[PDB]
């Protein structure tokens, strides 16, 4: 086509989606990770995670308002990844890398798994 | 705005 | 913070949101523009448009599944802007610029209004 | 990935 493109559009959309999340506006699911709960938008979760894409395209699970993650999933690891989904920013630290990598593997977030593997290999 |  | 950032994340999220829209997955509103109907995600509309941000933060209108636009709004103009919302790509042409600009003004999409004004000024 |  003969379209023009607004460079910052995708980033501005994501910033507003994060603002809606922070204000609990039109959030439609709560992700339960052991004792912790995280409110989010199903569409953002699906757009970022192979696991959530699978769950919310399921004819029964698409209608659930609560999703309980595997008890082995670390809440801080999930929190870091949820923030990444809504911002493109990953808070990767020596103290959380193993939990972040395991959570990204479970959530099927290939690019996160990739940088975790690379950061781990550099420290060995 | 750019030509993509 | 000490975060790392994935450059293509925002663009990849938007691409997946557009894929969900094309497959009518978790769309939660229909925008009626005279004889035409457009299915979308309220969160994407709010993230792109001052008008939709106002409508879906309203305590009564947030719960509506149908939104009827002003009868003066051109369906093709709306279609072009809806595509822009989900892609960052604006199909701006001599034959549609007036309708696109009027629709962007109504929807409160300042950056679109700006490029329309600039393209019009260049042709006078 | 980059340093933002
Ligand atoms: N929502 C949506 C969606 C669609 Cl529509 N099409 C294709 N993938 C989608 N999302 C999704 C699937 C697999 C993975 C990710 C996202 C990130 C990753 O590492 N794996
Ligand atoms: N959703 C959301 C949203 C939030 Cl949370 N905060 C601030 N603006 C939001 N969206 C929004 C408001 C005004 C305009 C646009 C988008 C594009 C434009 O030209 N005007
Ligand atoms: Cl439920
Ligand atoms: Cl990822
Ligand atoms: Cl309704
Ligand atoms: Cl805009």
Where does residue A101 rank: exposed (0-12), middle (13-18), buried (19+ CB within 10 A)? buried
String of DSSP letters for A13-70: HHHHHHHHHHTT-S--EEEEETTEEEEE-HHHHHHH-HHHHHHHHSTTGGG-SEEEPP
CB of A43 closer than 8 Å to CB of C26:
yes
Which residues, at least 6 apart from A31, have a Cβ–Cβ distance to it below 8 Å? A37, A38, A39, A40, A45, A67, A69, A78, A82
Give the number of domains in chain A.
Answer: 1
Domain that holds residue C119: 1-124
Contact residues, C window 59-98, toward A, CB-based 8 Å cutoff:
62, 84-85, 88-93
Chain C residues whose CB is inside 8 A of the A48 CB are 13, 16
Question: What is the rounded distance in angstroms from the CA atom of residue D4 to the CA atom of residue C122?
Answer: 36
Please name the method used to determine this structure. Answer: X-ray
Token pair listed for A73: 């999933």
Task: Pick from A29, A43, A47 the residue to mutate for probing ligand 1's pocket: most ligand atoms within 8 Å of its CB.
Answer: A47
C-alpha distances (whole Å) from C31 to each of C3, C27, C35, C52 are 39, 11, 11, 10
Which residues, at least 6 apart from C110, have a Cβ–Cβ distance to it below 8 Å? C50
Token pair listed for C12: 């990849």
Distance from CA of A48 to the nearest CA of C (A): 6
Question: C31 phi and psi, to 5 degrees?
Answer: -95, 120
Dihedral through CA C91, CA C103, CA C34, CA C55, nearest 10?
120
Token pair listed for C25: 């997955």
Dihedral through CA C50, CA C109, CA A89, CA C11, nearest 10?
130
CATH number of the domain at A81, please: 3.30.710.10
Which residues, at least 6 apart from A81, have a Cβ–Cβ distance to it below 8 Å? A90, A100, A103, A104, A107, A109, A112
DSSP summary character for residue D1: -
- Strand pairing class (A29-33; A4-5): unpaired
Resolution (A): 1.7
Token pair listed for A18: 């994060």
Question: What is the rounded distance in angstroms from the CA atom of residue C49 to the CA atom of residue A79?
Answer: 29
């Amino acid at each position: 086509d003969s379209c023009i493109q607004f460079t910052r559009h995708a980033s501005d959309v994501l910033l507003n989606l994060n603002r809606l999340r922070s204000r609990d506006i039109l959030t439609d699911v709560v992700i339960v990770v052991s004792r912790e709960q995280f409110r989010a938008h199903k569409t953002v979760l699906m757009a970022c995670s192979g696991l959530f894409y699978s769950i919310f395209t399921d004819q029964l699970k698409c209608n659930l308002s609560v999703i309980n993650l595997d008890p082995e999933i670390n809440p801080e690891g999930f929190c870091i990844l949820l923030d990444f989904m809504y911002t493109s920013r990953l808070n990767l630290r020596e103290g959380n890398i193993m939990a972040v990598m395991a959570t990204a593997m479970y959530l099927q977030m290939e690019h996160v798994v990739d940088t975790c593997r690379k950061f781990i290999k550099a420290s060995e | 705005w750019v030509i993509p």
